[PDB]
Amino acid sequence: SGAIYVGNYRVVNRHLATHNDWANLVWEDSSRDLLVSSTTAQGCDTIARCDCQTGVYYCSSRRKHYPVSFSKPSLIFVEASEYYPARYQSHLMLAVGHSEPGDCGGILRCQHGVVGIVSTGGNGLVGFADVRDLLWLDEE
Numbered sequence: 253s254g255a256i257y258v259g260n261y262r263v264v265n266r267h268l269a270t271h272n273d274w275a276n277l278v279w280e281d282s283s284r285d286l287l288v289s290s291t292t293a294q295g296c297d298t299i300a301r302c303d304c305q306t307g308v309y310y311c312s313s314r315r316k317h318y319p320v321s322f323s324k325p326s327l328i329f330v331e332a333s334e335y336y337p338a339r340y341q342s343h344l345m346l347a348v349g350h351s352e353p354g355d356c357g358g359i360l361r362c363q364h365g366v367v368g369i370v371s372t373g374g375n376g377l378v379g380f381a382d383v384r385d386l387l388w389l390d391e392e
């Protein structure tokens with residue numbers, strides 16, 4: 253689990269969104285495994301606006317923060333899971349690292365801010381849903 257709090261927005265994995273998130277829905281995309289809902293209180297996170305390929309991510313199944321190199325956001329085939337059938341997931345970035353289903357929500361961050369959140373894993377790889385193209389998160 254995990255979320256990003258920026259301005260009056262809450263960014264979570266679409267598969268982990270609550271009844272309140274759907275009731276206060278701003279934007280969602282099943283093909284990205286992302287959902288944004290509105291909040292009453294102001295958040296303190298800053299979204300990165302960059303093309304960085306190195307950062308650090310939190311892995312809850314290891315209680316550790318790992319430095320990693322990661323790929324550019326792309327359309328990647330993702331095997332069937334408890335929450336989605338087999339499909340292509342868009343805006344996804346991979347790194348060599350550990351990831352288990354309950355690790356979804358873990359933040360990936362570079363020197364500029366939050367880059368994305370853990371969304372996929374398996375085979376010694378970890379995948380992150382990019383949020384750097386969602387420019388509207390910085391305004392209104």
Ligand SMILES: CSc1ccccc1CN1C[C@H](C(N)=O)CCC1=O
Nearest residue numbers: 285330333351352353371372373374
């Ligand atoms: C070894 S499977 C694994 C590992 C780490 C994380 C996630 C998974 C499988 N998964 C992928 C889904 C998706 N984004 O398409 C989201 C929910 C889920 O459980």
Ligand SMILES: [Zn+2]
Nearest residue numbers: 302304362364
């Ligand atoms: Zn950056």
